[PDB]
Design a protein around this ligand. Structure first.
Ligand SMILES: *C(=O)[C@H](CCSC)NC=O
Ligand SMILES: [Mg+2]
Ligand SMILES: [Mg+2]
Ligand SMILES: [Mg+2]
Ligand SMILES: [Mg+2]
Ligand SMILES: [Mg+2]
Ligand SMILES: [Mg+2]
Ligand SMILES: [Mg+2]
Ligand SMILES: [Mg+2]
Ligand SMILES: [Mg+2]
Ligand SMILES: [Mg+2]
Ligand SMILES: [Mg+2]
Ligand SMILES: [Mg+2]
Ligand SMILES: [Mg+2]
Ligand SMILES: [Mg+2]
Ligand SMILES: [Mg+2]
Ligand SMILES: [Mg+2]
Ligand SMILES: [Mg+2]
Ligand SMILES: [Mg+2]
Ligand SMILES: [Mg+2]
Ligand SMILES: [Mg+2]
Ligand SMILES: [Mg+2]
Ligand SMILES: [Mg+2]
Ligand SMILES: [Mg+2]
Ligand SMILES: [Mg+2]
Ligand SMILES: [Mg+2]
Ligand SMILES: [Mg+2]
Ligand SMILES: [Mg+2]
Ligand SMILES: [Mg+2]
Ligand SMILES: [Mg+2]
Ligand SMILES: [Mg+2]
Ligand SMILES: [Mg+2]
Ligand SMILES: [Mg+2]
Ligand SMILES: [Mg+2]
Ligand SMILES: [Mg+2]
Ligand SMILES: [Mg+2]
Ligand SMILES: [Mg+2]
Ligand SMILES: [Mg+2]
Ligand SMILES: [Mg+2]
Ligand SMILES: [Mg+2]
Ligand SMILES: [Mg+2]
Ligand SMILES: [Mg+2]
Ligand SMILES: [Mg+2]
Ligand SMILES: [Mg+2]
Ligand SMILES: [Mg+2]
Ligand SMILES: [Mg+2]
Ligand SMILES: [Mg+2]
Ligand SMILES: [Mg+2]
Ligand SMILES: [Mg+2]
Ligand SMILES: [Mg+2]
Ligand SMILES: [Mg+2]
Ligand SMILES: [Mg+2]
Ligand SMILES: [Mg+2]
Ligand SMILES: [Mg+2]
Ligand SMILES: [Mg+2]
Ligand SMILES: [Mg+2]
Ligand SMILES: [Mg+2]
Ligand SMILES: [Mg+2]
Ligand SMILES: [Mg+2]
Ligand SMILES: [Mg+2]
Ligand SMILES: [Mg+2]
Ligand SMILES: [Mg+2]
Ligand SMILES: [Mg+2]
Ligand SMILES: [Mg+2]
Ligand SMILES: [Mg+2]
Ligand SMILES: [Mg+2]
Ligand SMILES: [Mg+2]
Ligand SMILES: [Mg+2]
Ligand SMILES: [Mg+2]
Ligand SMILES: [Mg+2]
Ligand SMILES: [Mg+2]
Ligand SMILES: [Mg+2]
Ligand SMILES: [Mg+2]
Ligand SMILES: [Mg+2]
Ligand SMILES: [Mg+2]
Ligand SMILES: [Mg+2]
Ligand SMILES: [Mg+2]
Ligand SMILES: [Mg+2]
Ligand SMILES: [Mg+2]
Ligand SMILES: [Mg+2]
Ligand SMILES: [Mg+2]
Ligand SMILES: [Mg+2]
Ligand SMILES: [Mg+2]
Ligand SMILES: [Mg+2]
Ligand SMILES: [Mg+2]
Lengths: 56, 114, 209, 61, 123, 119
RNA sequence: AGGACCGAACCGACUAAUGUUGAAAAAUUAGCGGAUGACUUGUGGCUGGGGGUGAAAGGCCAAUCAAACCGGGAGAUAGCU
RNA sequence: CACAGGUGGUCAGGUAGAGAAUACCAAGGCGCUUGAGAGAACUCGGGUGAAGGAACUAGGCAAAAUGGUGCCGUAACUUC
RNA sequence: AAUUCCUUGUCGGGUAAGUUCCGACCUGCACGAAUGGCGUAAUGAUGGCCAGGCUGUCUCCACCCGAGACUCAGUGAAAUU
RNA sequence: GAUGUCGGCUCAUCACAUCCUGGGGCUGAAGUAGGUCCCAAGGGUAUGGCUGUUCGCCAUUUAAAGUGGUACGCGAGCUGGGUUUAGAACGUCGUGAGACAGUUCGGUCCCUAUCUGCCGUGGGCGCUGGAGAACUGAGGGGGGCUGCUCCUAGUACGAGAGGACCGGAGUGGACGCAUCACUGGUGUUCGGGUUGUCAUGCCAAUGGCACUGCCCGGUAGCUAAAUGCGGAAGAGAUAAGUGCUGAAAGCAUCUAAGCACGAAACUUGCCCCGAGAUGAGUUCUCCCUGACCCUUUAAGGGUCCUGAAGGAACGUUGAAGACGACGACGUUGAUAGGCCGGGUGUGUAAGCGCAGCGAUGCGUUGAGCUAACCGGUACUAAUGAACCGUGAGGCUUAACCU
């Protein structure tokens, strides 16, 4: 149910070893609008693989 | 699969008649005893038919000597010699399992004319 | 004796002329082809590495390609070894067929069992459930005790517990070979073999016999 | 162990005693006393008595 | 698929009407008895003047079951209810002189040959 | 386990799920494009496309069926009079998913789903 | 007619599983008993601590009861920790 | 505590119903202030289950079952 | 026997098998006559025992539907040491 | 300044003083079946009735229903019948409060796991250039039960009754593994019947809600009660035991020299894991063959170019899966959805027409609809890239090649 000894900070650190975030490897650049975006997602301006798929 | 289908089709009997549920059918089956294959008849109502090509089957119910008996025949088994529709019945269901809890005058199923 | 690498097509049945319906697993044993031959001199033991099926040219890696190329053979979906007995020779290019099984009566079939995922002890170890009612509190399918008191003061190794079930190599033995068919590259064996439909199956002549 | 009684000690200890004759198939239980030994003694006595009674019965018959 | 506590009907004319299976014989921990399997039974309901008497513990052979019997080709055969033929404990041969209702090929052997002969239908 | 089983449960009870698919499909039909969560969008493909297919053959029975499925006469009309003939040549694939980032309120991965001859 | 019967509201609280760092310092859901009476309920009033009240269980008397609570005697006394 | 609790009175629509029960609705009011996925074990709350049918268990606990109106019919015993 | 220690008394019933149950006997450790004796229809969320029906209670678990559990985002405790 | 108690349940694990199965000696061992002792712990080793029971008696099984240890194993795993509070009553003791290892009826069983442990499953680094595969097998785990029938043979044995060893064949029980072809279960994602009610203007037709409203069927999957397979044979070294030859001890003696047989135990054989086997192994294949500074001059640091093999990431995903992981595919494309065709399931849709006063019936019609199935099909989505990974790989000996 509960600890018998306060665990160390070292232990905590070790535990958190795997809690790190991975940044996006790289962003795709749209061919037409030249603006960066996530692979397989549309851009913020609304392009996807060159064509304008959405208004705003 | 295709291969499986091929395997199956070459085993299927081609002469199987057009019975439905309710039909009073008469299945003749091969019976070994000693060293003499003979042909035992099993006349009853078809209560359920299961269509799966080679794996096809049908459940014939009768009342042998007071006791009710269902028998499930594997349709394309060579142990069945001959299926034959002695009468054809008008039922509204694919399966006549309500006939298990019905006897005599209740278990009647009207004949399907035309 | 060596064995072949087939693929589980599916199950079906063979009605015998007598009456009996034999449940058969259908194994599509495409022409296996030798890629490499091992020996006591170089490798340290006698065996044959074989491949089977086709593979995508765009998907096969360079190293993989090279190995195949050296052999002088089409690239297949995998490579599998077979230990050779004394008095068994194979050239590198050679293609072994299901015709090899014509003489055998029984076979051991090996393949990866179906994955049941994380299984509890009722499924995985056939543990008896506890009482469904009569007072039971939150402990119907739970594993019960897992040890004794202060001695030994630990759970012993290989205690039966919940965990991953299936998706592992299993081997059914002494399966009767119902029919060999060189025409369609089929082997029919009586009874269910491991794995799902489309899974690879190493068929070998039965060691027990 | 004895029937019912009262405590932890009672629950654990095996004071009750059931003596049995292998030739005759007679039995004598005792769990009157706390002391196993005493019970045994009592039980033994009972058994002895029973044997005597059986011998007398036989004689009578 | 008869087990301890299962009430069967009687096929023979021994005297008994209703009998309860008290033991499936022929193996430790043996769960069920299907057709052709000998069971120990006790007579729960009997006729006024028969061979057997109520509360009589004796053997019986199971001749029909509701679960049924599978054949080599895979053709199952069932019945509407479970039944048995009473037998002597020692001699293992029927008490009655007359078997009612249909039985099966499963039953036929050197042991239960009388029964099959008696029976009106053998499926 | 769930080998070979189709159909997302979507942390909903069955009836509720059905309702939502009916609504969503209708909305899509109306607007020809909608922004929803990606899984939901995916699910919708197996409701809307079939409806579209049904709408190709204009019969009374078919119309009735459509109505039953959807229950908005307007939607049905749209399907039969516009989308059915509009997708007459097209053999499936009436719709298009485009992934569109993550919803602010709960980081739920969003996606547009749109009819293929929208623009 | 009825401390009659079946049954909602209302009053209760026999079984159950749940909860047991609760949604809750006693509840829940499913069933359960009474339901024109020795019923139930609102509002106001009266009984006070060896005192009350008690169809009586040492029950209840503000989440406190084999002698309430608050303040005081008071830093009681403690051969014990 | 923005707490599954407690809090007296009045109003009392429709269809079915004996009904203020119950079901579905009206007038009116709400979706209960974390969502999104996934579809392991195990827990909770439910559904179904071959054959058997209390063998479970301290105990049929729990479930299952019975369930309405009319008419026939209804034993011991009884303070009638 | 809500009372019997010896005691699972003995005999009978019920069950394939009954330390419980019912009927007897009386050998009442240690019943007994308003701290009432013996009966008793009716009533009981009362104790014990047996039967029919019914059943996942169980043989022996299987599948399914939802709420957690698991992963992502936001917020963010606790006993213990 | 707390170590929760009998029994039940669930899970066990060890000992051997062995209950069954295996091996053997002696027998007051003819045979069958026993008695007794020695070896042997591989596996196996009962369901019920009664009682809170452990125990035990009884019923019926079984090859056998072993005896013990483990906090008389196991309540941060369940129960709470017994015990061990408070209510009440009987007997009994007491003047009484009350009391009894007398009896009786009633009576709250908390804990989200830090560490060890164990079951699973990943990330990091390592294994000395990097990469993709296939292996070897140190070591570890699993498995190991047994009945009945028939033959041998009514032979051997025996006065008869009865009735074998050895060896062989079949078919079961229990347990385990796999699987879904069959028989079935489930199948709130398929079809249908049907009650009440609300809605779609109404009719007709549909949908919502009522536990999936209540039912009847049922596809895929998952599944057991379904059906395949398993336990071995063999080999080695032995146990008790049995010997052979053989002296010490002219004989005798299985032992001292030497040689042999000998069991479910041991080591192998069968199945699975397994090179973190840091003792980091082997085999095959693939990939990289450029500059110049710099100095604290060494397996040193830097900047331009360069970026392979392959990997990851992203996407479409899976009979893989908690998450990671593993597998498949990404247009040179069937990976998913859709679509087409089929199958399966349900059981003759709607609309129209005819018959009927009508409920309804008949025709069109085995119709319509049909999930997870099968075979096809690029219609939609799987993007051109980008990212990590480099640029021939230390020293010392030996042997070769030249
Ligand atoms: C024995 O006296 C005791 C229980 C008493 S309950 C008031 N057992 C151990 O602590
Ligand atoms: Mg401590
Ligand atoms: Mg973490
Ligand atoms: Mg899986
Ligand atoms: Mg159990
Ligand atoms: Mg609790
Ligand atoms: Mg529970
Ligand atoms: Mg799929
Ligand atoms: Mg959620
Ligand atoms: Mg609903
Ligand atoms: Mg009243
Ligand atoms: Mg009260
Ligand atoms: Mg309530
Ligand atoms: Mg009432
Ligand atoms: Mg008191
Ligand atoms: Mg008082
Ligand atoms: Mg108070
Ligand atoms: Mg006071
Ligand atoms: Mg005082
Ligand atoms: Mg003072
Ligand atoms: Mg002080
Ligand atoms: Mg709130
Ligand atoms: Mg509130
Ligand atoms: Mg109303
Ligand atoms: Mg209401
Ligand atoms: Mg909320
Ligand atoms: Mg779930
Ligand atoms: Mg149910
Ligand atoms: Mg059932
Ligand atoms: Mg049934
Ligand atoms: Mg019954
Ligand atoms: Mg019982
Ligand atoms: Mg029991
Ligand atoms: Mg109940
Ligand atoms: Mg119920
Ligand atoms: Mg007395
Ligand atoms: Mg007594
Ligand atoms: Mg008696
Ligand atoms: Mg009595
Ligand atoms: Mg008295
Ligand atoms: Mg007097
Ligand atoms: Mg008096
Ligand atoms: Mg009185
Ligand atoms: Mg009362
Ligand atoms: Mg804190
Ligand atoms: Mg302490
Ligand atoms: Mg020994
Ligand atoms: Mg001996
Ligand atoms: Mg061994
Ligand atoms: Mg009973
Ligand atoms: Mg009992
Ligand atoms: Mg009992
Ligand atoms: Mg203990
Ligand atoms: Mg413990
Ligand atoms: Mg305990
Ligand atoms: Mg607990
Ligand atoms: Mg503990
Ligand atoms: Mg108790
Ligand atoms: Mg008291
Ligand atoms: Mg005393
Ligand atoms: Mg109570
Ligand atoms: Mg309780
Ligand atoms: Mg690793
Ligand atoms: Mg080993
Ligand atoms: Mg199946
Ligand atoms: Mg299938
Ligand atoms: Mg079915
Ligand atoms: Mg169903
Ligand atoms: Mg199925
Ligand atoms: Mg309706
Ligand atoms: Mg209408
Ligand atoms: Mg509504
Ligand atoms: Mg000698
Ligand atoms: Mg000599
Ligand atoms: Mg000699
Ligand atoms: Mg040897
Ligand atoms: Mg390595
Ligand atoms: Mg193509
Ligand atoms: Mg069809
Ligand atoms: Mg319809
Ligand atoms: Mg029509
Ligand atoms: Mg007319
Ligand atoms: Mg017709
Ligand atoms: Mg179709
Ligand atoms: Mg396909």
């Amino acid at each position: 149910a509960v600890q018998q000894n306060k665990p160390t900070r070292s232990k905590r650190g070790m535990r958190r070893s795997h809690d790190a975030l991975t940044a996006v490897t790289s962003l795709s650049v749209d061919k037409t609008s030249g603006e960066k975006h996530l692979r397989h997602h549309i851009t913020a301006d609304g392009y996807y693989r060159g064509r304008k798929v959405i208004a705003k | 699969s295709n291969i499986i289908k091929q395997l199956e089709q070459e085993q299927m009997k081609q002469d199987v008649p057009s019975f439905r549920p309710g039909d009073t059918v008469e299945v003749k089956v091969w019976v070994v005893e000693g060293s003499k294959k003979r042909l035992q008849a099993f006349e009853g109502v078809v209560i359920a038919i299961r269509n799966r090509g080679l794996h096809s089957a049908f459940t014939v119910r009768k009342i042998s000597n007071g006791e009710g008996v269902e028998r499930v025949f594997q349709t394309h088994s060579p142990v069945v010699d001959s299926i034959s529709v002695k009468r054809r019945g008008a039922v509204r269901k694919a399966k006549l399992y309500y006939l298990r809890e019905r006897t005599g005058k209740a278990a009647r199923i009207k004949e399907r004319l035309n | 004796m060596i064995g072949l690498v087939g693929k589980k097509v599916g199950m079906t049945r063979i009605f015998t002329e007598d009456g009996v319906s034999i449940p058969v697993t259908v194994i599509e044993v495409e022409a296996n082809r030798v890629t490499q031959v091992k020996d006591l001199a170089n490798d340290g033991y006698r065996a044959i590495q074989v491949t089977t099926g086709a593979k995508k040219a765009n998907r096969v890696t360079k190293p993989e390609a090279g190995h195949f190329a050296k052999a002088g053979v089409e690239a297949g979906r995998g490579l599998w070894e077979f230990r050779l007995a004394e008095g068994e020779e194979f050239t590198v290019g050679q293609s072994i067929s299901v015709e090899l099984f014509a003489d055998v009566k029984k076979v051991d079939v090996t393949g990866t069992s179906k994955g049941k995922g994380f299984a509890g002890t009722v499924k995985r170890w056939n543990f008896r459930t506890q009482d469904a009612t009569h007072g039971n509190s939150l402990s119907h399918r739970v594993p019960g005790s897992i040890g004794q008191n202060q001695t030994p003061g630990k759970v012993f190794k290989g205690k039966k517990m919940a965990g991953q079930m299936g998706n592992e190599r299993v081997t059914v033995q002494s399966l009767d070979v119902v029919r060999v068919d060189a025409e369609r590259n089929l082997l029919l064996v009586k009874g269910a073999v491991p794995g799902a439909t489309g899974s690879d199956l190493i068929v070998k002549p039965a060691v027990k016999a | 162990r004895t029937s019912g009684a009262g405590g932890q000690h009672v629950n654990r200890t095996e004071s009750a005693v059931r003596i049995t004759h292998i030739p005759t198939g007679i039995v004598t239980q005792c769990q009157n006393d706390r002391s196993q030994h005493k019970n045994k003694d009592q039980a033994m006595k009972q058994m002895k008595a029973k044997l005597y009674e059986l011998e007398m019965q036989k004689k009578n018959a | 698929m008869i087990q301890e506590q299962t009430m069967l009907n009687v096929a023979d004319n021994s005297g008994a009407r209703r009998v309860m299976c008290i033991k499936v014989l022929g193996g430790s921990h043996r769960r069920y008895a299907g057709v052709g399997d000998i069971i120990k039974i006790t007579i729960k309901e009997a006729i006024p003047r028969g061979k057997v008497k109520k509360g009589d513990v004796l053997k019986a052979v199971v001749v029909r079951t509701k679960k049924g019997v599978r054949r080599p080709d895979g053709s199952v055969i069932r019945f509407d209810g479970n039944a048995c033929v009473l037998l002597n404990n020692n001699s293992e041969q029927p008490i009655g002189t007359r078997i009612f209702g249909p039985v099966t090929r499963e039953l036929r052997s050197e042991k239960f040959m009388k029964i099959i002969s008696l029976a009106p239908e053998v499926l | 386990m769930r080998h070979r089983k189709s159909g997302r449960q979507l942390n909903r009870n069955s009836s509720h799920r059905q309702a939502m698919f009916r609504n969503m499909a209708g909305s899509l039909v109306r607007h020809e494009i909608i922004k929803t969560t990606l899984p939901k969008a995916k699910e919708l493909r197996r409701v809307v496309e079939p409806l579209i297919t049904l709408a190709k053959t204009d019969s009374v029975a078919n119309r009735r069926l459509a109505f039953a499925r959807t229950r908005d006469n307007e939607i049905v009309a749209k399907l039969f009079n516009e989308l059915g003939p509009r997708f007459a040549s097209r053999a499936g694939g009436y719709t298009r998913i485009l992934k569109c980032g993550f919803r602010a309120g709960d980081n739920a991965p969003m996606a547009y789903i749109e009819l293929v001859d929208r623009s």
